[PDB]
Write a protein that binds this ligand. Structure first.
Ligand code: HEM
Ligand code: HEM
Ligand SMILES: [K+]
Ligand SMILES: [K+]
Lengths: 249, 249
């Protein structure tokens, strides 16, 4: 049900130019997984019932950066500031979601559609809305479903964002990559999830919860078997995520 | 703009009977100021914009009791549990606001009108909405005005609740009573505020802020000069406070 705001031609020019510079920067710095995380944690605080939180620029605020769920994302914010300063017309809100869309594209994933127009809001949401890696399916539906308003299908496909990147013991406490090729966006997260625990590879309890839920497990199976299906469902879910509370939510 | 819900006759019987038992209990235990504080801190978390928080029973939850603003109110909650258990039909939400109305009446203050029907909600609001004693007039309008939706007049009159009770260094860190007769509800809070700092009596920076604001100071002056006016404005404000988010807000 989205109705995206009109933005000036100069604004659209800056988007296009920012998108290209983000590709080169993110590729050079090898920081696509951290930028995807930055985009997700920005959006993932949306609560449909109160219409608070969401991808509106607040993650750069030191008070939101201090949320323990956000450990290490100050690095992300810092890395992007010089480039953002080249695009003063853009909202931080738009800039961070664009970086997430680009992070996915330059690691070889699907092209997530992007619509500009998000405004930078003044107040960060309360801490505690992002998911707890130590919990399971009920918790996941509470956060993605009851708060953000995404579907069970969205939960599984977005979990596949872990196909890139790694945990760090000094940030969450968990450690290592989910896949053997953590700078490559593919369906390997699901393939590893199905094969058991491979030495050196990470599985959060929240990942494992997908294997035991009667709705989530068919989806893991479909994605492990069909990367195209994964990419389609991923692109849908990431667009919805990136637009929570925006242009009608 | 209130439209109060219908409640059963058995519910109204329990209100009337609870009101009388609360008088005797609160008088015997000399805990009227702590019960007023309990009622206020229950209500004072309302945010009109999101319609979250407010006098809906959540302060008895250990997670809300743990808010540092609420230090010492677990005592209040404990004191009331035996009596509440005599009125299982009543919501905790109604019971705590009734105790606040009674606390004011048995110390000799105005009769604040009371309407039953508040429901006990499952989730406590985020911490941090209650006012900071170390701040001033802007802060007060942010909390009472922008969040709760009360008037500048309401802020000054409700500040007069400090005419009963005292701070404790092991609860907020501040210490002592605002008045020489802290179990007597009268306009003495304003009279002391005007006379300067009397030895042994407390003034928070938030109290003092009332003296320097061009809207609040006329009100302090009116109340110090006219206790009847104070009681009228107090009764209005406390009813509005006790009904935030309830029966239309
Ligand atoms: C489903 C529930 C989720 C939980 C419990 C969760 C939890 C975690 C944890 C604990 C970390 C490691 C942080 C560290 O120590 O560095 C992590 C990292 C990561 N998360 Fe998730 N996450 C979830 C969903 C998501 C979603 C929906 C996305 C985006 C589509 C995502 C993208 C990532 C990425 C890319 C990393 C790697 C970061 C890096 O390499 O530095 N995650 N998550
Ligand atoms: C206006 C901003 C307010 C601030 C900054 C504030 C702050 C404080 C503080 C710091 C304490 C002492 C807590 C302790 O250490 O025990 C206190 C106590 C108290 N507050 Fe206020 N308060 C405010 C408004 C209110 C309102 C609106 C009411 C109710 C009408 C109220 C009723 C009381 C009462 C009765 C006590 C005495 C409690 C006792 O004797 O144990 N206050 N407040
Ligand atoms: K991978
Ligand atoms: K007094």
């Amino acid at each position: 049900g989205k109705s995206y705001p009109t933005v000036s031609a100069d604004y659209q020019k800056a988007v296009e130019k920012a998108k290209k510079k983000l590709r080169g920067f993110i590729a050079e710095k090898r920081c696509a997984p951290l930028m995807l995380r930055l985009a997700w944690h920005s959006a993932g605080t949306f609560d449909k019932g109160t219409k608070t939180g969401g991808p509106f620029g607040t993650i750069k605020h030191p008070a939101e950066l201090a949320h323990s769920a956000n450990n290490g994302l100050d690095i992300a914010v810092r890395l992007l500031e010089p480039l953002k300063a080249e695009f003063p017309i853009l909202s931080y809100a738009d800039f961070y979601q664009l970086a997430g869309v680009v992070a996915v594209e330059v690691t070889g994933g699907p092209e997530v559609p992007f619509h500009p127009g998000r405004e930078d809001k003044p107040e960060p949401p309360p801490e505690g809305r992002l998911p707890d890696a130590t919990k399971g399916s009920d918790h996941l539906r509470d956060v993605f479903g009851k708060a953000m308003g995404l579907t069970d299908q969205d939960i599984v496909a977005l979990s596949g964002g872990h196909t890139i990147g790694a945990a760090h013991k000094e940030r969450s406490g968990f450690e290592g990559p989910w896949t053997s090729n953590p700078l490559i966006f593919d369906n390997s997260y699901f393939t590893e999830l199905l094969s058991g625990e491979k030495e050196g590879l990470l599985q959060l309890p929240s990942d494992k919860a997908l294997l035991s839920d009667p709705v989530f497990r068919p989806l893991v199976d479909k994605y492990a078997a069909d990367e195209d299906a994964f990419f389609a469902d991923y692109a849908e879910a990431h667009q919805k995520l990136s637009e929570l509370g925006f242009a009608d939510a």
